[PDB]
Amino acid sequence: LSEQLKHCNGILKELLSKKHAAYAWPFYKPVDASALGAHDYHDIIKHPMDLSTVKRKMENRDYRDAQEFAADVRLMFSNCYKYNPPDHDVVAMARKLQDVFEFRYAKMPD
């Protein structure tokens, strides 16, 4: 459980690492809707999430189990799949980052 959360922290660090930066970078910080001209973003996405928030929650010991952590990471991807047309580049980047997440998350210590 402590062990499971360390696995989660390792994943998080990987998702933030240089190795994945080419597709992970849109997920590094909260969506700035005004900056992007996306004035409908917060009407469509009721629960924003991003990797810096996941990181803060982990550093603050907010996550009590792996399932809670996974739910936030997956929310982040779902927000992207909900807001953007499925043929947009940002969606391809999300799918690639999600593949990295899901395959390593699956190796949960038990």
- Tokens linked to 34: 């005004």
Q: Candidates 19-27, 28-36, 66-74, 90-98: pick the segment binding Ni ion (CB under 5 A).
A: 66-74
Tell me how far, at minimum, the Cβ of 3 lies from ligand 31O, in Å: 30
Which residue, 36 or 106, has its beta carbon nearer to ligand 31O?
Answer: 36
DSSP 25: G
Q: Counting contacts by CB under 6 A, is residue 105 touching ligand 31O?
A: no
28, 16 contact by CB (below 8 A): yes
List binders of ligand 31O among 80-99 (CB under 6 A): 80, 83-84, 89-90
3-state secondary structure of 109: coil
Question: Cα(99)–Cα(107) distance, rounded to whole angstroms?
Answer: 13
